[PDB]
Design a protein around this ligand. Structure first.
Ligand SMILES: CCCCCCCC/C=C\CCCCCCCC(=O)O[C@@H](COC(=O)CCCCCCCCCCCCCCC)COP(=O)([O-])OCC[N+](C)(C)C
Ligand SMILES: CCCCCCCC/C=C\CCCCCCCC(=O)O[C@@H](COC(=O)CCCCCCCCCCCCCCC)COP(=O)([O-])OCC[N+](C)(C)C
Ligand SMILES: CC(C)CCC[C@@H](C)[C@H]1CC[C@H]2[C@@H]3CC=C4C[C@@H](O)CC[C@]4(C)[C@H]3CC[C@]12C
Ligand SMILES: CC(C)CCC[C@@H](C)[C@H]1CC[C@H]2[C@@H]3CC=C4C[C@@H](O)CC[C@]4(C)[C@H]3CC[C@]12C
Lengths: 196, 196
């Protein structure tokens, strides 16, 4: 397990990515993976069970949790990571397939494929950031949430678990996503400039 | 325990009360006493314990009960009965004292005392009916009560016990009080007419 092997694996051996997409994007991806691993089960592990309301009606806790957390932050970030990494995996499979098909018996199509992949990665990053903004306005979470949904009578006080730790990790993940967006835009601009 | 003794005890031997205050008012008083006895502990016995709210906060049941029942119907009717019967007791003691003081050694003063007593009885009846109207508007009680008072968070659903039975007994007691008011007014008018 040497450094050259890991660097080649993360690069995708597409021979078209510059330093800002081969040395920096991979590092940010590793950072996001590590943060998600260290915060997936320790922080968001008991988001459902430790979440309690101040009522006595059965079934109000579950409906309140589903009302205020349509999809938890960790799962949303996992989906974002998978969809962002999908175009890179597609480009890696494309270049491997091209090497295989030329082995049994080209630059422009690979360049266009890489550019389209970076554009789609940027689009997925922006879409997931916008979805996060829609579902959870603001970067901070509150301890008290007032819920008025059936079967809870009138308005009940539900209490979120670890709002501050989740706020810290939300800040970290949003900063990483913003850095990824900036790097992808810079990579697209640099490729366009070098093409012309 | 003959009928003449009970009739003399209820009349007050004031020799100034007509049939509508010596035959009918005493019967209505007995009716109210009997209804209050048969409804004081059986119906309103568990008004506090069977009264529960739909919250989990400690101490919300007591504050909600005190908010919606400042003074229970049975205690209010008991106070009304005591204060209504006080002037009759005063007149009975006055006539007994007059007999005693004339025994050891007058009509106009006794007549005026009886008239003032009937006026005060009517005033107490009206005052207690108005207080009942102020505290509990309407003759009917509802199962659900929405309470928003500290420490209960937001608005909680409290459930009264036996609203329909309490409504029935409220109707009975209010009808008896109205009959008492009408009889007292008739007695005052009859005495004034006979005086002139
Ligand atoms: C996302 C979560 C991250 C967590 C934090 C991780 C922190 C860091 C943790 C771990 C990082 C790796 C630590 C061990 C590195 C040893 C490298 C080594 O000796 O290489 C040598 C041997 O290499 C081999 O032949 C294979 C060695 C396998 C290493 C482990 C593989 C994955 C383990 C999965 C574990 C799963 C469970 C993990 C926990 C869930 C290189 O080979 P060589 O023969 O020397 O090369 C030719 C010789 N010549 C050069 C002289 C010509
Ligand atoms: C608000 C609650 C209401 C409840 C519903 C009530 C429903 C009805 C219930 C009860 C009503 C009364 C029933 C018994 C009546 C007997 C009368 C009798 O025999 O009289 C005779 C005897 O009389 C006496 O010498 C005294 C008799 C006492 C009767 C009971 C007194 C109170 C009891 C309290 C109990 C406490 C516990 C009660 C429950 C808590 C009359 O005397 P005499 O010597 O014949 O006279 C002279 C003779 N000569 C005429 C021939 C010349
Ligand atoms: C420029 C940056 C974004 C490049 C990042 C490369 C990512 C997308 C690539 C590099 C190595 C890849 C992994 C290599 C091998 C496997 C094992 C397979 O059974 C499941 C997929 C999985 C786990 C791949 C997922 C995608 C992956 C992590
Ligand atoms: C015309 C109507 C209103 C007359 C009603 C008469 C009422 C006011 C009188 C008649 C007999 C009275 C009772 C006779 C004896 C006693 C025992 C005494 O230790 C306490 C008061 C008490 C219990 C009296 C309360 C008042 C009383 C009930």
């Amino acid at each position: 397990m040497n450094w050259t092997g890991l660097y080649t694996l993360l690069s995708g051996v597409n021979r078209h990515s510059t330093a800002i997409g081969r040395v920096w994007l991979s590092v940010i991806f590793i950072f996001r993976i590590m943060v998600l691993v260290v915060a997936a089960e320790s922080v968001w592990g008991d988001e459902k069970s430790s979440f309690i309301c101040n009522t006595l009606q059965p079934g109000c806790n579950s409906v309140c949790y589903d009302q205020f957390f349509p999809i938890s932050h960790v799962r949303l970030w996992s989906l974002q990571l998978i969809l962002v990494s999908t175009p890179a995996l597609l480009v890696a499979m494309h270049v491997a397939h091209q090497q295989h098909i030329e082995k049994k018996m080209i630059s422009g199509t690979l360049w266009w494929t890489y550019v389209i992949s970076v554009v789609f990665r940027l689009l997925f990053e922006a879409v997931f950031m916008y979805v996060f903004y829609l579902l959870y306005p603001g970067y901070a979470m509150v301890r008290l949430v007032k819920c008025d949904v059936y079967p809870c009578p009138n308005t009940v006080d539900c209490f979120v678990s670890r709002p501050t730790e989740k706020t810290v990790f939300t800040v970290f993940m949003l900063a990483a996503s913003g850095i990824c967006i900036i790097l992808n835009v810079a990579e697209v601009v640099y490729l366009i400039i070098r093409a012309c």
